[PDB]
Amino acid sequence: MISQSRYIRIISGVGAAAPVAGRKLILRVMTTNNVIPPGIVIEFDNANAVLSYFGAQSEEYQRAAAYFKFISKSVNSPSSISFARWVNTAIAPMVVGDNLPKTIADFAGFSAGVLTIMVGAAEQNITAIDTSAATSMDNVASIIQTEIRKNADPQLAQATVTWNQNTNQFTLVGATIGTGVLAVAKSADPQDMSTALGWSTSNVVNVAGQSADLPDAAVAKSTNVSNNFGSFLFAGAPLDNDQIKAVSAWNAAQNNQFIYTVATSLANLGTLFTLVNGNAGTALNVLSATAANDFVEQCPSEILAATNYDEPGASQNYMYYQFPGRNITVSDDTVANTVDKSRGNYIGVTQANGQQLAFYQRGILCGGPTDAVDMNVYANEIWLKSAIAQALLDLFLNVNAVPASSTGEAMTLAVLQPVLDKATANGTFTYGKEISAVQQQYITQVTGDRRAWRQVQTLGYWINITFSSYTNSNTGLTEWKANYTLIYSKGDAIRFVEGSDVMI
Template identity: 35%
Template sequence: MQMQGNISQSKYVEITSGVGGASAATEKELILRLVTANAKVAADTVLEFEGLDAVGAYFGTSGEEYAAASKYFGFVSKAVRRPQKISFYRSTLSALAPFVRGTVKAAALGDFKDISDGSFSLSMGGLTYEITGLDFSTAPDYATVASAIETKIRANADGGELWTAATVAYDPSENVFVLTGGTAGDAIIVAPSAAASGTDITGMLGWSAGSQPIVSQGTDAQSVSELLSKTLNLSNNFGSLSFLPELTAEQITEAAQYTHAQNMQYQFLVRVEPENYAQVQAAVSGYSGVCLVYDAYADNSLPHILPAAVAASADYNAVNGAPGYDYQKDDTVAPSVTDDATYDKLVPLKVNFIGRTQQAGLGISFYQPGFMQGAVEDQGVYMNEVWLKDKFITAVLNTQLGLNKWPAGEDGLTIFDTISQPVREAAKNNGTVSVGKTLTDTQKVYITQLTGDADAWQQVQTQGDYMVRKIVQKSISGTMQYVLQYTYIYSKGDQIRKVEGSHILI
């Protein structure tokens, strides 16, 4: 029997399948971001690495990037966790010339000697020239190859000093070629490509787009604030930030001002020394988010990396997973404070340090006292709020992206309650929010005035938090829009720093 055709089932029932409610926004990681002047990092680029080996493979193992990463990844928390990722950003406090740096090894010298008509097309500073007639047949080494290319590039006088002072260098430590524009400042550069004629050598140099070279645009010198704004805009996936190049007192102050203005987005870690700690502290004392760490050693023992490692290794999904910063240990860092006199100078200024005490003749060193500059003194409380704020942001973004529409009515408030409740529970579970902490009379009055609810303080004291939310209309960018506003009041998870006892013998 011959099989007959059928009318398409979609004429009667048509079902479209897809994944609903999937998360589009991810939570940020409280990792360390280091600002570096290393020439292997392009301007306006954030590089992230998972593990020390990856940092060493990229930067090498003899530089300051590897030294800092070694301290960072070497930390093991009290919960037996360690940081998993670190990020780097190129310093633009000085103007940078555009450059192209190979990331794959150059072709064998013998291969270059086979080239008598080498060519490529180069675009730099808005101009494009074809570099042709490159003859390497008698080149005795890679440096001669680089010099021949440099001469051809510099011959394009119409490009100005960007071209006539350009350099091409061979880096024997990594077997790569580096092309650098002749002037520092704002200028566009593109990975070289094949010319219309001749033998394309971009792949041999490691400069072709397919070779994935480091391509860095020329950049004018930026202020500290401009640099921080740019790195935060490119990626806010970090919880701690520090500079590898040494900053002036004025630059530290500017960075502190910018950090303060971001309202608890990250902590700014600053290494201070015996000669400058008092001056720096006086300049930044009013700015929140600034963590000063004292180092008595001129060779930089990197004690300011420790609090970044504590933040990055925290497990906020665990019971009591929100860490305190006081009493954190790193035995690879020598103590900078070993006497009461220095302790008594630094602690009132909220300057942190690795300090040593002893028990039964055994020295014990640990990070202390875990204080920040500005209004939020406790470093753990500050970083907990960085985490908590991001949890709320992520929940809201995913709701807006996942729903067809977030209704501006009671249903909308119910949706907010639904997405915020898991965040509140997580905060209570990990210790960011403290349940059952006794409030002072001043705190009770403040909560009552803030909420207009005479019983609100009791909920904060017994349950740890209190939420007020409403939907209002506001003019935003010249148009009236519905806005959900909320106020979240919570009892912060403080840390016991000292135990005092009385032993009474009868």
């Protein structure tokens, strides 16, 4: 008798709900599971969704469970996660197109005239398939498989089919590996399965057969699909030294965009540090051989994804957080010194008598002398670059033209002002630190102006705008470009304490 909902609607919802618009600093996992198509990335907002999609036995549920149940000093949670697939072996072409719970065994009464159409190297049609029995979906899959086997075209000669129960979709897999493309098209015949079945209907994922690829190429392709994440890693078996070195080099090719986290054994640190000396953006973590992995390498990613940059005082430290679930690795002073000289991260125990407490200590990160070493600075630069880029693109998209005159310079400064104010609010910019003589010389060398060090000392930053002209490579023509330079005092976190006491 008419619903009060159509007049009044309250959504309610549990507390600690914070809508966010901007780049998400969320974890991304590269896996070798067969369920995930190669060219598509997926996201989840809860561990229950991950369980529904994958299942308890799969270790990805373990990773998601560990990832999600984290609380920072200010009460926050990652609230998101990303997944993508890496292919390490040549694969046959395949198709998949279902996500909604269409399968309630409606194949009954559809036995007459099944006219599904497959499009590939040669157009071919499928004979009528009996489905009125509809005993079980696996039986249906076997029936369609046999009907496909009745064909002689070699990629469909040894074709297979599969049904998953957690997620509802049908998969077709060809025979030949590494080459070939398949497609499916609906027909004018109303008595068809392709319309009712997932594929050939609206959003359907299609896969092209292709050889195995190096991991760096896989992550590059994943970024090309979408780059809204941070601090990716590789799941499953440990990678080889050469592959890790290549991935680190590729990450260093991007100029301070993501964080590469790996897990390695204690005895293996000597090899990696020599290989991956420099090449900033890579984090090394110590893994315990005796016990279970406990997924130590996720810690920096969880810490990074937990923080938010809209609220004041966002800058955090990585030196003292406690993870009760994880397992202790090192307990000796000399061992800690050796690992520190090798520039690694770990969890060190102290006391263990009466009480017991350990924390993920080293917030340091491997890299060259020029680039930032500590991690909080790295994260702050990531956020800052994202914000500046977004502001500049907004300026270009709103104003009709930006003249190459002083007024254009004024417009650019006016647009950049709010981002700088927010940065000062967060804590990425800091004020009051003293400047050494060599630092003063460095600053005066970078920017031609003297006395800028006074403003970077007091206010915390210094910016300039300059426009010039240039010629591009693709076309012989010339355009006008704008050059800006930004210098600021990096944020810092308390790490060590000095004290003194005298009685008079």
